[PDB]
Design a protein around this ligand. Structure first.
Ligand code: 160
Ligand code: 160
Lengths: 238, 238
């Protein structure tokens, strides 16, 4: 039992929150290209056998509400849980159309003590959003009851390092989401999740570089950030 | 080339900063047991063929200094770099004997742009320290400049989740370090680093629970936190 039981009747839900248009009141640009991201995740997770539910342009409130309701579902027959957040953001924050939401609030609904039908099951959060304004210019090449931690079995696949900008191309989508999808399509049938995510790290880090008319944003790099509290290996098959 | 080149003439340095006694002026307890931690890491890393250098009770200044100097070495002939910080801490902070140091300051010396002999080489930071005061009560069971990001090829193996306390036993050491060492001893010859670190996560999360005379700190759990910006697989052999 080094790997998670992934032979339940259902793989699980894959909730995609796709925020494209924001309230002018926030002073935030449209996320051109995010639809391509959404469509790619949908098809990719569909082939993995996940029940996909897309949600477009949700308010901070709608996001909290969506997450609460989903955490209140009976996941007993589901192997895992995937949530993908596509939006603007800051460190520890994701933006609804009308304002920011703490990631901690979203993930808390899924704590091992608050979502009992998911206790002991992998809970994946995939987040394409900025975590700050830093830019990366790159470099040329005894005692033994039987409790488990409530923050355990979480995996947070971040599109970028803490404090840094996250890059999104207007026609093809975010660097991170395109690479994740591609790596999943190529390797989900043979590789452990962590290893697949390392391939993504590499692809994003080597194959992408920003091009901008504005010197300040031109020739920048990006590295994704895998944050794992998983206690087992994850394979998308059996 | 899915895995890091680990056949250089030397595996690399393994710096262990072991802070046990702090200045009264800080109002911080001695870290009873940390010596067991230090001794175990030394032995474990020695078997892995790492050049181990232990440093006891360093000041915030002495730490900055140690790191500067080590980043200024010629690591051309080294496959990797390991740094282990054993001390009190807070989110993003590690304490010297006389005060706190920002982790970012420590790791920045090793950025791909500031330590050219480690560019493209895995830089591991293993950290036994608190990240806050939260407690875990648990639950019963086109376009192609060939740059890479400067923040890439880093791995931060945190003893605990963000915001949380990290547990250390007076006679046997920290829960995290004892488990890391054991897992390295058992699996370093066959398993990829990430997978080993996942075993650690499991061991800590299942086999450990606090026991305290004070209800506030009794029966608590802990989950470690793997943070990976690696672009390749890491094996401690070849
Ligand atoms: C910052 C965010 O929250 C947002 C995340 C998201 O997916 O929307 N990041 S962003 O893509 O909007 C972003 C990226 C870099 C800088 C900024 C500040 S506004 S400056 C806009 C620069 N223009 C570009 O986005 C690009 C230039 C070249 C690009 S390419 C073809 O190399 O991908 S993209 C906001
Ligand atoms: C706060 C820290 O950064 C420090 C990190 C370190 O390695 O020193 N963590 S700590 O172990 O000092 C720590 C952990 C929880 C709470 C506190 C503040 S009050 S300490 C309460 C008394 N200690 C204990 O209850 C135990 C110590 C080991 C225990 S066990 C279950 O392993 O036998 S219980 C500080």
């Amino acid at each position: 039992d080094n790997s998670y039981k992934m032979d339940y009747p259902e793989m699980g839900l894959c909730i995609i929150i796709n925020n494209k248009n924001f309230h002018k009141s926030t002073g935030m640009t449209s996320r051109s290209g995010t639809d391509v991201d959404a469509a790619n995740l949908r098809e990719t997770f569909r082939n993995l056998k996940y029940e996909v539910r897309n949600k477009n342009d949700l308010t901070r409130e709608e996001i909290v509400e969506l997450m609460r309701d989903v955490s209140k579902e009976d996941h007993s027959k589901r192997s895992s849980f995937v949530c993908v957040l596509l939006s603007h953001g800051e460190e520890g924050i994701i933006f609804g159309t009308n304002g920011p939401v703490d990631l901690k609030k979203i993930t808390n609904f899924f704590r091992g003590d608050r979502c009992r039908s998911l206790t002991g099951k992998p809970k994946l959060f995939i987040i394409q959003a900025c975590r700050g304004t830093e830019l990366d210019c790159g470099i040329e090449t005894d005692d033994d009851c039987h409790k488990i931690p409530v923050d355990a079995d979480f995996l947070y696949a971040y599109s970028t390092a803490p404090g840094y900008y996250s890059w999104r191309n207007s026609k093809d989508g975010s660097w991170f989401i395109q690479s994740l999808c591609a790596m999943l399509k190529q390797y989900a049938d043979k590789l452990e999740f962590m290893h697949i995510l390392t391939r993504v790290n590499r692809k994003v880090a080597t194959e992408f570089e920003s091009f901008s008319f504005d010197a300040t944003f031109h020739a920048k790099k990006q590295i994704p950030c895998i944050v794992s509290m998983l206690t087992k290996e994850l394979y998308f098959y059996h």
